[PDB]
A paper describes a structure:
In order to investigate the conformational changes that occur in Pals1PDZ upon binding Crb17 peptide, a ligand-free form of Pals1PDZ was crystallized and its structure was determined at 1.8 Å resolution. This crystal form has a single copy of Pals1PDZ in the asymmetric unit. The structure of ligand-free Pals1PDZ reveals a sterically blocked peptide-binding groove, as confirmed by fluorescence polarization in vitro. Firstly, the carboxylate-binding β1–β2 loop (residues 260–268) adopts a more open configuration pivoting at Glu260 and Leu267, resulting in a Cα shift of over 6.2 Å away from the C-terminal end of helix α2. This exposes the side chain of Pals1 Lys261 and ensures that this part of the PBM-binding groove is solvent-accessible. The Leu321 side chain adopts a favoured rotamer in the absence of a partner peptide. The Phe318 side-chain rotamer adopted in the apo Pals1PDZ results in a steric block to the central part of the PDZ peptide-binding groove. We therefore considered whether Phe318 could act as a potential gating mechanism restricting access of ligand to the PDZ peptide groove. We note that the ligand-free Pals1 PDZ domain closely resembles that of Par6, which is known to bind both internal and C-terminal peptide ligands. Examination of the open carboxylate-binding loop of ligand-free Pals1 PDZ domain with Par6 bound to an internal peptide ligand suggests that Pals1 could also bind internal ligands.
Author numbering: 251 to 335
Amino acid sequence: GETVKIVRIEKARDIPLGATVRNEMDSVIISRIVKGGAAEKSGLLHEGDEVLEINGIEIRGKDVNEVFDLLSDMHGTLTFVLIPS
Ligand SMILES: [Cl-]
């Protein structure tokens, strides 16, 4: 029951993404969606989503702090490639 989805989210310049992530082996999984952030506002990211790509950058195989680092420099439109829980 897995289907790859492409979702595009707008992240205003004074609004954090507000999503937390965890590693399950090489997989990167969304843990919490925080109220007030761009993720929550968009309604397009879900707890349990496995993140494959963000703006073309491969995400599988990366650790939690690497991912947060990458996100911190991404503004404007963010295109996620993911597998829903
Ligand atoms: Cl803006």
